[PDB]
Amino acid sequence: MEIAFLLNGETRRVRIEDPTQSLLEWLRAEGLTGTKEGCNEGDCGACTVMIRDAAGSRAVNACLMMLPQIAGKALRTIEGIAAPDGRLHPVQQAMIDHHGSQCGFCTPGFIVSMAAAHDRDRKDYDDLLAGNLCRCTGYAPILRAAEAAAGEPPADWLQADAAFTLPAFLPETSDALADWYLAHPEATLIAGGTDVSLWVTKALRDLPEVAFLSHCKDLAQIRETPDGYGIGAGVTIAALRAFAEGPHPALAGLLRRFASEQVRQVATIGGNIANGSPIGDGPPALIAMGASLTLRRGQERRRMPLEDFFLEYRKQDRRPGEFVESVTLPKSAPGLRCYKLSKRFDQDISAVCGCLNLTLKGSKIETARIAFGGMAGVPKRAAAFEAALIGQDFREDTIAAALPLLAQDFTPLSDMRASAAYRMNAAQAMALRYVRELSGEAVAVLEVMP
Amino acid sequence: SVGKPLPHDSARAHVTGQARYLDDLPCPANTLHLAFGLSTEASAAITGLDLEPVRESPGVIAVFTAADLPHDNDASPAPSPEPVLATGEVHFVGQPIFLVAATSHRAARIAARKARITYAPRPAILTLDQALAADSRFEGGPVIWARGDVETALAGAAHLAEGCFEIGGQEHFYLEGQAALALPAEGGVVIHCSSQHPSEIQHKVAHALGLAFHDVRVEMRRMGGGFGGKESQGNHLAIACAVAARATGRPCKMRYDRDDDMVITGKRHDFRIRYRIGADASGKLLGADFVHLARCGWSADLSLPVCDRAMLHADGSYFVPALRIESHRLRTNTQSNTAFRGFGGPQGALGMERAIEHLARGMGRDPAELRALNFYDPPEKKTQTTHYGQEVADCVLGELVTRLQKSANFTTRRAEIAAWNSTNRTLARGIALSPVKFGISFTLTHLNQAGALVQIYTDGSVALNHGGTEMGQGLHAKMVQVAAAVLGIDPVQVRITATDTSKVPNTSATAASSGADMNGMAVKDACETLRGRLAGFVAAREGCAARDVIFDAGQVQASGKSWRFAEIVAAAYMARISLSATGFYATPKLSWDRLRGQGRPFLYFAYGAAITEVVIDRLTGENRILRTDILHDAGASLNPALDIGQIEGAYVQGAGWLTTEELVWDHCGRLMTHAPSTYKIPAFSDRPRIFNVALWDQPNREETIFRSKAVGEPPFLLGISAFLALHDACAACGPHWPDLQAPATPEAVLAAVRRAEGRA
């Protein structure tokens, strides 16, 4: 089982004997030592590498990326950012000018992230470089570098890779996968690999029976159904956020604070749902906006409201040989809001994740769709709080009066992220916040101007 | 070259990815890889230890117990012992019990978990009150220093403010984690490691192997950050490596995985500070009374000097006529806490900063004004002293703060926030100014020494070597600048060489911000010896006085004639004059008694101030720093650029300590925050949206290297202004005292909001 790919402008063919080996491992075993291991967990971006294909170019974490995934793609590492002749990237030079490096260990990751941003001409440096942790500089000099480099023309040698291409199961079509997974139910389906790769790197597990879904085009589609949007399980979080910009600015707002840019490029919506995490941020959003899930088993196809898929803690409504195929979101959801709470804003896991969605019959509450993450063992709606809210007036005092009922809906946990007290308080705090934001009051601290 | 904003010594090498770190260095095909087998109990005796499944595990070459160690089993920087491998008992969850040597890093980590260890558990001493209740402590009692009589002062104070608050610890999170490599080289070993103190590595490895010091050679080129976390925590790896290298006959490499790293190694000492501060009717301080309860962990490490510095900085920035500290260094069944940028300094200063803020609010005066009224007097019959009796005669704080407040627009903004606050009810803004007075030097006097070794080659080019280690602070760049300045040459001609115990022996740890300070001097000494030799030669050859020979801009000038530096050196070579010299410096004037808390521990103090502005969500506690303004005294800066960078970074790290970074242990002493997904250092957008840093540029009173000031640690304390601003935002929410605790997480902020609001 041999794969080929463009490594820093030069073609390379590789026999894959261990399907689970990360790209970071391979690069360093090759001597391409410029890619650093910072944590091997996704959070620090010290291993950021730049991949390219038909879809464009993006910066990803090398440590989460397993080899069979870069098959057919063009890969660019730090030691490939500078020109063949030796000339530095506008990004690299600017970083030397503006003192963007101190100890230098995170510099390779940043350069790669900035170069990819430079290639795609993207200037939202806060969200882009959130994935790259630095402990020395205080970030200020790196911003000066990024802005100074932005005025320069793109590296043409980096763009020359776009000419390219134009043991472990890798399906071509959705039907092909449905065939194989039906025969191999006990299999480890790897999509983005941003959860699965932590079982090998951290949990030191071994995965037999492996299949990579990130090579199925038809599974990674956003299509328009005459009732909403058919979003396949293969659609990446970044792409989902990209699409949501228009129809659902609330979801796009939330997905901005979903992981980092490097994780969002490869991590998928089907995997986020199929991980079945209580602190997952995909489900509560979609459950609040009334989205349905579609499961597939060969030629069989089940459909349901997303909240019903989640039965219990680490327990889902999944048959043997059944996989997550897609989700359907309605065309509009104007009353939707998304509240993610965590110690830090960027690149964090939610303590509480409030998702409120009310519709109004002019002053009075028609429908209550209020869903929470990190409040239970499963992402679920606030049944008693919702029921008590229907028929009431949409004003602070009424919502304030129903707040005790949330303490019947959930009995939250205490851990390193938050105490149960605070989690409970936050869920109640988000309800008052929803009424205030809808009444034109200033509520978001991130929106404040210096 | 000194004073030019020149770039870091490996700036291009960093940016290209060509800069080598330990795990990057190429080594022999047969290099073994090491991993520790860690304890799962907080306090137990080891009844049984079955390492059979560990040996059977694939790729494993050797497995080691404490019993398998030849000679010493100690890695403590203390006089007291701290085992590398556990000896019959365990003292915290994450203590190395055994050592695995496998053919791959992965294979060793896999094998490390395969052990079968049976424990006889004892009651653990996890919390401060427990340690205090069970008398679990170090030094056999609390260290107490008194200046004047607090008890009598506070009894007749016009305004009194008592209180107590927690200040959490801090994980260093240097991007390059702990790492070492041993190479057995004919009867002796060569160690490469990511360490701030290669001399102690040598000292430890030597005892570990039972070799004389001249048989252990440590080389260290660069760290991927250190922050104090690599001042002693490196010992364990280098010992394990040399021990395994000795036993297996082949090279051994060890690097902690990020999750091992946080579980094993120490952190910043988390303190509890109880305070009693008092002032008179005019607002001058009458007395301040402090008790420090410091968490040390299972082992001594560097707790003794850390808590000494917390006490030394308990005055903060202010003159207090009567002051007492009661410093309990408490032993707990947790990680052996260690050095961290500031070295207890921030902890003690914050105690003073919270108390003075409390007092300010308690009597209802603008904290800025009360702080201003109470600074040490400016230079120019008697100079004020610290509580430890050291004269403060370089205090610029009064003027500095006045400058900063003009440029930061302090009085206008503070009024603008007041109005904005009364427009909102969900959001609140806060602003605060925090001063920094930080003493420079090791409190352990004899460690205030550094050495250098300089070679001039016949082609004119120079090879520079000093005792200090590069962890990102631009130390090598500063020394190159100093060297090229003293010799009168272009800094291009000076090449820095990796830190080597065989080149410069008996070095101290690169700590106390004294790195550039003492090595600057040491380099200057070596260069002046060399410049002197060349000047003397030219003067003889040209017939005149040595002092009349000018060395400038790569040109030498004597008797109206002028040569290039290379021309003179080559000629001096031909003349048979040594082009090699050692340099050495010891900090003068330092003498103090630790036990009585009297004397002059510091050569000078470093000053600075920061004005921070923040927003808080009153519903959830969410918050961010909107604007920061810093005016820091770097003295006559060696490098303006490098220094601004240090301030920029140390601020963000100081603020991060008091905001989003939080260590959490479970009910069993298991560290729950042991990954970057649970420990949250400031991310890209966490930076001040308006970040203004300006150097207070005035030469140092004391004779330091080109009258610069140590800029490494002092700015870390500027992060206090962020915690003070966060408190100011909470105080804007109601009549009550907020009582904000450190760190000020969204949860901790919301608690302080609702206290001022008075909501149960």
Ligand SMILES: Cc1cc2nc3c(=O)[nH]c(=O)nc-3n(C[C@H](O)[C@H](O)[C@H](O)COP(=O)(O)OP(=O)(O)OC[C@H]3O[C@@H](n4cnc5c(N)ncnc54)[C@H](O)[C@@H]3O)c2cc1C
């Ligand atoms: C640094 C970092 C930050 C993160 N931050 C967040 C966050 O903010 N919010 C959040 O919700 N999550 C976060 N996560 C975890 C999150 O669950 C994943 O990153 C991602 O959303 C899952 O998508 P994936 O394709 O990577 O899943 P994978 O890792 O590919 O798979 C996860 C699980 O789903 C299964 N699976 C995948 N695809 C399918 C399918 N099509 N059908 C059936 N089963 C499938 C796999 O077998 C596996 O059990 C973070 C992870 C990292 C490493």
Ligand code: XAX
């Ligand atoms: N980039 C970067 N800058 C840094 C550090 C770092 O790791 N990386 N660490 C410090 C510390 S922490 Mo201490 O006594 O050990 S507790 S000494 C010290 C320091 C070391 O450099 P001198 O000032 O001695 O030359 O500067 C700081 N600036």
Ligand SMILES: Nc1nc2ncc(CO)nc2c(=O)[nH]1
């Ligand atoms: N920053 C700092 N580090 C130290 N390290 C070791 C020692 C040894 O006692 N002292 C100190 C000190 O006083 N300050």
Ligand code: FES
């Ligand atoms: S190693 Fe930290 S993200 Fe890849």
Ligand code: FES
């Ligand atoms: S520069 Fe030292 S970690 Fe980013």
Ligand SMILES: [Ba+2]
């Ligand atoms: Ba540490």
